[PDB]
Design a protein around this ligand. Structure first.
Ligand SMILES: [Cu+2]
Ligand SMILES: [Cu+2]
Ligand SMILES: [Mn+2]
Ligand SMILES: [Mn+2]
Lengths: 158, 158
């Protein structure tokens, strides 16, 4: 029951797609918003492309990325921010977070037209190294960037 | 060059193998022992097996693992410990560390018969989440475990 969010982007040797589905229960507790307090679960699917400049195989999950998001309702004008934390599900690893939409007590996060922005920084920010030697070395990481999406939130799918 | 260390184990839905190379110049700087001060680059190749109980596709590198090593020289008795940090090379991500062997003056880490032990803890120790709902949930993480290797160190590869 995954609803697609806009069109996927291909940049910095990665494919960056967005989806959302029913809220999910995550361990460890206390890091994420609880399932009952949320309406959706946002996910960032980031996998390596062909000939990734940082040495990642095609289709491999891009790990240790630092992802912040910004969800804007174009109609009501409401904006919220958070972070997508790394986790694994039955369809493998991803970056995600439970998000309150209708249940957001501030309001203006119900059914409507939206803009989603990711803010991604490379793995070195989290202590992930890379070889730079002649034989096995890879190229420089990307500078912090962002990708914009546009989608229509049709309501909670739970 | 790349010299293999012992047999690769199949434990806890993972293929765990060990190899060592020539000292690798790594970035960012400061994070690892310098290539000029080292004699080998110890490596731990850990990927998911078929039917992984924690949702990881077959072949995928297992991320966010805490790997501590204990390299002991059975002839001389000299022990040293450290941790293998995550990094990427042109053939993909792995856990590695530059190690001083002949260049370590504090012990007898020269050519001879060695024992290598990895002490691996699950991704949840570094704040890696997992879904536990019925629809998209995965199995419980493995408890901390050891894997043992026996090899003969022949010197710096060249
Ligand atoms: Cu998730
Ligand atoms: Cu390495
Ligand atoms: Mn998914
Ligand atoms: Mn290798």
């Amino acid at each position: 029951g995954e609803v697609p969010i806009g069109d996927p982007k291909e940049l910095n040797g990665m494919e960056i797609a967005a989806v959302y589905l029913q809220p999910i229960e995550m361990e460890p507790r206390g890091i994420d918003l609880a399932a009952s307090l949320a309406d959706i679960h946002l996910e960032a699917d980031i996998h390596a492309l062909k000939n990734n400049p940082n040495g990642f195989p095609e289709g491999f999950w891009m790990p240790y990325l630092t992802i912040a998001y910004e969800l804007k309702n174009t109609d009501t004008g409401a904006i919220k921010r958070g972070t997508l934390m790394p986790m694994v599900a039955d369809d493998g690893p991803h970056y995600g977070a439970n998000i309150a939409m209708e249940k957001d007590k501030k309001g203006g996060f119900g059914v409507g037209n939206y803009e989603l922005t990711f803010y991604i920084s490379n793995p070195e920010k989290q202590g992930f190294g890379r070889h730079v030697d002649e034989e096995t070395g890879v190229g420089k990481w990307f500078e912090p960037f962002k990708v914009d999406y546009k989608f229509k939130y049709t309501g909670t799918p739970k």
